[PDB]
Design a binder for these strands. Structure first.
Ligand code: MG
Ligand code: MG
Lengths: 122, 80, 90, 86
RNA sequence: GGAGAGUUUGAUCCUGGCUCAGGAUGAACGCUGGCGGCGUGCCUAAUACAUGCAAGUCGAGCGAACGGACGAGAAGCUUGCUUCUCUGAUGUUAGCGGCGGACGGGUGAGUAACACGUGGAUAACCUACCUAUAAGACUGGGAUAACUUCGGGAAACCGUAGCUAAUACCGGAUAAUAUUUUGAACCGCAUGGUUCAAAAGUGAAAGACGGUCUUGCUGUCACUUAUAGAUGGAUCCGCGCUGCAUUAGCUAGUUGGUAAGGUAACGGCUUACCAAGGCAACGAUGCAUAGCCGACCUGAGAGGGUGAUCGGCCACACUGGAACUGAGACACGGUCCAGACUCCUACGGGAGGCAGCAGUAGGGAAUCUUCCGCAAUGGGCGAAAGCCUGACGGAGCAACGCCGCGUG
RNA sequence: CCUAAUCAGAAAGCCACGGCUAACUACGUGCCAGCAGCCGCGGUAAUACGUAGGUGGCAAGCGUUAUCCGGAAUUAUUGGG
RNA sequence: UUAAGGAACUCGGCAAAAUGACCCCGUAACUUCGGGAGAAGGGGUGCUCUUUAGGGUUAACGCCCAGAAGAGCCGCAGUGA
């Protein structure tokens, strides 16, 4: 489960391609994370252009986890990868697109701008 | 935008289906023909003369047009 | 697809058409094959014209749909009388 | 069609070490626009020999053909003057 | 048809650089301002674009609906209303099908090479329409849109079950230089070419409108086959076509051969094999810059610079790729795919492409009206009338320039 | 476009003036403000700055800037050392 | 052996795991020009059938040796340990 020093892909129009998970906001020393859990990340590489750069540090919201979530109907889900999306506590992204489909349980946390964009709510 | 060529679309699709049926019917006839070259009965003349009719039953319309037809006959009316 | 036709050459207000043979694919005011004759609808009414009328028949004998505005003046010169006098001859 | 007396070019040879083939060096001399003099620059026209008939060092002319291959067009027509050690 | 003047020094002649006078701009800026004729107007961000139009046409090929002039029978008597029956002129347009959308208009990101110019070749090619000629124009069938009816679809649009035609589509018959094969003559630039003789091989609309009318006859147009003509296109070739050598080795499908395949055609165009050649100081290669030419500016002239308008050639159409229809496109207002971008959505999914005319933002020192019209010329369809034509005619804005008159 | 009528009433400016270059005098200014294409002006009497007057040029056009050729025989084959 | 993560443990990636054979492509800096260099990185490998190159050995038969080309079959995995 996503935790400290975990490298992820991304999904948006950033100029960035992967990140690092410093801290996993919540409680009093959480170790873990899953879908929906905001995190504090940084940047370990970059494609050229784009707003963000190396050495930067920003938050993110996890999605496309590889050990997926259990729905209360008793159904599960699993992706292949791990990923995240950049964010500014509008709970609305910086980016303009979202590749790489999304997990819907974000909706409980009242995220809808990225759900406007994601193929598909799943 | 689109104005009128939508006609030529539908027409293009009809003539697509027709033309490929003609061509591929020929091509299978040619396959039979060249494969009949190995054989010894005849079993050749029926097939090869038939296909050399079909080349012309189907050449008058499509893009071939004659020169290449005449090359196909040129090689194929000789191998038997 | 070959049509003797007109290629206006004057400036703003005083046009001076030219008779010329051409294929219809071309632009009007562009490329041609050979000039013959000419035209001038003013500075004298009736107009001032010339004509080859020697090889102008050549292009008709081997193909043309000569237009009507031309056909009129070729009648005014009357070379078409020789044209049909050979074509509808036989 | 019978109109062209083909471009006949004298020359001499530079190789025979390819099949059915030789490599003529036809040469000229041409003037120079700023000045009014003459000067000579060569070329190397490849060729179709029938059966590697003619030799190296030979004195021969050629003629326009049609594209026969990729970067050889010309024929041989007539070797003029053949000899060995000169 | 051609002009020199200054300037190093206490003063001189020389060599030597710099500056000035002239002409020219697709030109901007400052000042100023009357008018007409002519000609011009995104040279920058090939940056993104709202709104309008920019390519349809044929009912004299076809089925099918609207329509209602005229004629008329009974009438509820309101004696012109009308129910039907309806006679059916003129006309229309949804659709099928034929030809055009590839021409015409616009721009110059790319491209250093047969791309362009010029001169040649094709015994290595293609060519709808339009002309001329010759021959034909026989005999059959089965479907299907519109139209009825059902369903899924938010919408885009899709499918279901019947039904109908044609210059649609599919067979057969017949048809010569057209393909194989055989032989005689003739010919040459080499492979090969021209003609003659003989065995096998393919088509068409029984079509439409009209006259005579015997509905026969024959006409106009239309279709098919063939041979030419011309037109348009293609490939190859010699030559000329930019700068650096602080760019000197490059290339392996490269170079050559064999065979096959492929294409309108030739060809390493492409596969399988044999081979190691090929190109280069006469500047290969690699590198940055760029559309070219006729022409324009200047100069007495040789020459130097540029490639605005006008015209010829080429490439491109959001970027990139592929292919169908078709005579011709690998298609500027066509598709299919992937991508970036913008947008609609019931979130399942769909839509689009101004470097067409105008116009808007953007950049920039700087480049205009969301104009009238199809009278003319040229286009496209048609039998013609006719219709469409932001090509084009032509009005408007700018002292942008040339020319001209005057402010007595 | 033509024909008749009406009023000199609506309709003129820009640059430069030491030489190169056609085109001079007064004021203010005093190495300050300023000009400049070159050479150079300017420290209390500036023909070179700013103002006036006048003049020359030019014309519904004029000056400056950027670019190109000339002059440049300063890539010189014509035409050098 | 161990899903998710992958040196955060830690004095220190100690140890453990990963790589590992054959052939082919390819292989920088620097250099005492020998090397670096197995650099790196990357690919293929199984059985059957067919066709073919071959070389050594012999009178020849056949006995050995190790390649290429196609075409097929299977399994997640073909130097299957
Ligand atoms: Mg990892
Ligand atoms: Mg690490």
């Amino acid at each position: 489960m996503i935790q400290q020093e975990t490298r992820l892909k991304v999904a948006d129009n950033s100029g960035a391609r992967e990140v690092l998970t410093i801290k996993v906001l919540g409680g009093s020393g959480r170790k873990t994370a899953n879908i929906g859990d905001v995190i504090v990340c940084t940047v370990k590489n970059a494609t050229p252009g784009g707003v963000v750069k190396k050495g930067d540090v920003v938050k993110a919201v996890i999605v496309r986890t590889k050990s997926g979530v259990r729905r209360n109907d008793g159904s599960y889900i699993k992706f292949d990868e791990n990923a995240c999306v950049i964010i500014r506590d509008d709970k609305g992204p910086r980016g303009t697109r979202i590749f790489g489909p999304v997990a819907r349980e974000l909706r409980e946390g009242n995220f809808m701008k990225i759900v406007s964009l994601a193929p598909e709510v799943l | 935008n689109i104005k009128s060529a939508i006609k030529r679309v539908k027409t293009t699709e009809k003539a697509e289906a027709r033309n490929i049926s003609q061509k591929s019917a020929m091509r299978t006839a040619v396959k039979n023909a060249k494969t009949a070259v190995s054989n010894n009965a005849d079993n050749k003349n029926e097939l090869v003369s038939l296909a050399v009719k079909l080349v012309d039953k189907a050449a008058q319309s499509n893009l071939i047009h004659s020169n290449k037809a005449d090359r196909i006959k040129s090689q194929l009316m000789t191998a038997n | 697809a070959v049509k003797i036709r007109l290629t206006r050459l004057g400036s703003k207000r005083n046009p001076f058409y030219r008779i010329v043979v051409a294929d219809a694919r071309s632009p009007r005011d562009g490329r041609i094959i050979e000039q013959i004759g000419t035209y001038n609808p003013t500075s004298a009414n009736a107009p001032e014209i010339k004509v080859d009328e020697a090889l102008a028949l050549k292009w008709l004998n081997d193909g043309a749909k000569p237009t009507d505005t031309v056909h009129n003046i070729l009648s005014k010169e009357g070379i078409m009388k020789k044209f049909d006098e050979q074509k509808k001859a036989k | 069609s019978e109109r062209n007396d083909r471009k006949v070019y004298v020359g001499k040879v530079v190789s025979d070490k390819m099949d059915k083939t030789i490599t003529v060096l036809v040469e000229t001399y041409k003037t120079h626009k700023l000045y009014g003099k003459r000067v000579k620059y060569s070329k190397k026209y490849k060729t179709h020999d029938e059966n590697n008939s003619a030799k190296l060092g030979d004195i021969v002319k050629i003629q326009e053909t049609r594209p026969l291959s990729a970067t050889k067009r010309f024929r041989l027509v007539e070797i003029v003057e053949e000899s060995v050690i000169i």
